[PDB]
Enzyme design. Structure first.
Site, PDB file in Angstrom:
ATOM      1  N   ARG A   1      28.270  51.285  35.274  1.00 21.07           N
ATOM      2  CA  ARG A   1      28.424  49.917  34.556  1.00 21.07           C
ATOM      3  C   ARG A   1      29.988  50.465  33.874  1.00 21.07           C
ATOM      4  NH1 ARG A   1      24.540  47.571  33.342  1.00 21.07           N
ATOM      5  NH2 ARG A   1      24.407  48.404  31.292  1.00 21.07           N
TER       6      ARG A   1
ATOM      7  N   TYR B   1      33.239  48.588  35.351  1.00 21.89           N
ATOM      8  CA  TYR B   1      34.546  48.268  34.733  1.00 21.89           C
ATOM      9  C   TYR B   1      35.573  48.583  34.772  1.00 21.89           C
ATOM     10  CZ  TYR B   1      31.169  46.802  31.934  1.00 21.89           C
ATOM     11  OH  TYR B   1      29.362  45.708  31.583  1.00 21.89           O
TER      12      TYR B   1
ATOM     13  N   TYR C   1      33.919  34.503  31.951  1.00 19.67           N
ATOM     14  CA  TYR C   1      32.782  33.428  31.003  1.00 19.67           C
ATOM     15  C   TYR C   1      33.337  33.533  29.784  1.00 19.67           C
ATOM     16  CZ  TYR C   1      29.195  36.589  30.933  1.00 19.67           C
ATOM     17  OH  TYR C   1      28.080  37.971  30.298  1.00 19.67           O
TER      18      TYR C   1
END
Ligand SMILES: C[S@@+](CC[C@H](N)C(=O)[O-])C[C@H]1O[C@@H](n2cnc3c(N)ncnc32)[C@H](O)[C@@H]1O
Ligand SMILES: C[S@@+](CC[C@H](N)C(=O)[O-])C[C@H]1O[C@@H](n2cnc3c(N)ncnc32)[C@H](O)[C@@H]1O
Ligand SMILES: [Zn+2]
Lengths: 262, 56, 262, 55
Positions: free
Chosen positions: A66, A70, A92
């Site tokens: 991950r 990013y 969000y």
């Protein structure tokens, strides 16, 4: 070029700040990470020039750290800034709360001599206080990423509300999965049992993303956590397990006592 | 093709519609043309099904 | 009647959510608690039927426990709800964060059989993360009311970012006036020195309320806090005193080492 | 109050905000702020700003 990172809140359309919506409307280009397709449609109508950051997640059954995702997201944003675009990142919630892409992009942008700033938004935490009717000023609060709580040395205050974020991937050390295993959750239970009884009631909380949707507020004993259905958006609330004790040395010095407290 | 998205966007940002909805969910949803299937999914809280009836 | 409590955030006009602004616009009556006169004028243009809750604060050195003030505020709000009005409370920041008025009004309204809800907003904490470029998730975070931290046994985790709210009135209580900020804050310093060196850098933070205004971000050694000029709106940030260290105990149970961390 | 009107616009309008950040004095003068109002902004004298309006 320039960078502004804004948050869209959790609820569709209505939970973005007035100024943040304006930033999106006036942007040359928008990089987005939103909860669902309804949000994506809303955004596209605000500003048609959108790049969906979701594309940088693993797809077609590939495995991907991950951290690499990013990095790719940040590079994409910076590429737009470097090219000269008035760039807005729309994440969000709050774009700087449990969100490294924003912080990373802003740091890098400033270092390369570009204007970059972050506008605050409404986070999952902010939604939790409202939905659960908890004023966090009452007894205080504390937040940790679940995995960090396991991998590093953290001591919670059991008199204060404790939030474990990203509970669904607790203990998943490879950073490649979107779920953890029950054995990992059981290890977390035993860890938390240093301060919290096994029968201590905890809450799995999910703020609603749609206006017709009720929040998830699932109460269960801590011991049952390894068997619970957890989603990427799940946050675990652990209410206090210990009663407050007076700081007598301080009270004496201030010249007050239990009488006039509570 | 459906009007689920248009409805949710309007409901999310308009306090009058929101208060009307909270008063009479089913009547408001019919008034915006939601199908019986869509309304059932809302009332049973099946978000996965709603996202299927939009056009993913 | 009905009650909705909304937040206006800290910045003028632009930091309110789209939906929360809509609630204000359509209310029969609005009870406000806003930062300044610019905000008050803004609100009045949204909806002319405003009652300013600031009127209930003690003036002319008249005797009124701030508990009585909140009581009067709540009664004013509920009187409107009871009369049949679609009532909105507009509070600065997040209406449910260090805001006894909203919590009390909502609790009582529900008890009397009225619809009552709270809409999350952008808090001072939300503004701090953005302004200082700090992610609470980086090493965790703990928030406490400064006075509660002093009165009760709350041992912080010095790897986290620690926020002490209402720092200006730290240790204050009706009787026995150490309204020597210096005195009360020196007691706090000595308390914190339990975990933090006297030369540890702390930050006095004040989010801006106007668009032309810069935030206060004042960095000073802990030892110098008792001499600082603090305002009601001041929040104290105490950055970590320690870097994160590996939890070998839990890594062991997981069957991994630091080298395995993704 | 043109001062209040300006601040309210600036606070909600991202285009005006960006224009302001590029050239604060020019934007303030164009929106009719006085020299003492502008001076108060540039010196960060919030107390005086509130005097130059009425609050
Ligand atoms: C990468 S962080 C994003 C947080 C986001 N920036 C915010 O402001 O809430 C993802 C984590 O945030 C929390 N979160 C995200 N969406 C949520 C929701 N709808 N309800 C509750 N917690 C949520 C969960 O802990 C989740 O694992
Ligand atoms: C009664 S609480 C109100 C908090 C508000 N509901 C919120 O969401 O931030 C007052 C405390 O909030 C914090 N606060 C309020 N305004 C602030 C500002 N402009 N900058 C920093 N902290 C602020 C301070 O700790 C202050 O003592
Ligand atoms: Zn927090």
């Amino acid at each position: 070029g320039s960078l502004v990172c804004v948050g869209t809140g959790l609820q569709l359309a209505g939970q973005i700040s007035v100024l943040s919506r304006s930033y999106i409307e006036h942007a040359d280009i928008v990089f987005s990470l939103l909860p669902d397709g309804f949000s994506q449609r809303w955004l596209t109508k605000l500003n048609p020039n959108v790049i969906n950051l979701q594309q940088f997640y693993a797809q077609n059954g590939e495995v991907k750290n991950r951290r690499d995702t990013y990095e790719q997201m940040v590079n994409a944003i910076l590429d737009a800034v470097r090219a000269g675009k008035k760039t807005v990142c729309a994440l969000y919630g709050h774009p700087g709360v449990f969100a490294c892409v924003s912080h990373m992009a802003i740091t890098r942008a400033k270092a390369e001599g570009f204007s970059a700033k972050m506008e605050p938004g409404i986070s999952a935490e902010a939604c939790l206080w409202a939905d659960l009717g908890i004023d966090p000023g009452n007894s205080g609060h504390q937040s940790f990423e679940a995995s960090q709580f396991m991998f590093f040395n953290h001591v919670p205050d059991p008199t204060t509300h404790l939030l474990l974020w990203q509970i669904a991937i607790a203990g998943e050390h490879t950073l490649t999965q979107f779920h953890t295993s029950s054995d990992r959750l059981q290890i977390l239970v035993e860890q938390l049992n240093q301060w919290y009884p096994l029968d201590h009631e905890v809450v799995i909380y999910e703020a609603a993303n749609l206006p017709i949707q009720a929040p998830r507020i699932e109460r269960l004993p801590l011991a049952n956590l390894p068997q619970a259905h957890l989603m990427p958006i799940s946050t675990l609330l652990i209410p206090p397990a210990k009663k407050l004790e007076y700081n007598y040395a301080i009270l004496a010095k201030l010249g007050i006592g239990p009488e006039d407290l509570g | 093709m459906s009007g689920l998205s248009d409805f949710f966007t309007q409901l999310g940002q308009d306090a009058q519609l929101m208060e009307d909805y909270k008063q009479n969910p089913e009547a408001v949803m019919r008034a915006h043309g939601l199908t019986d299937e869509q309304i059932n999914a809302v009332m049973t809280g099946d978000m996965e099904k709603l996202k299927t009836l939009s056009g993913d």
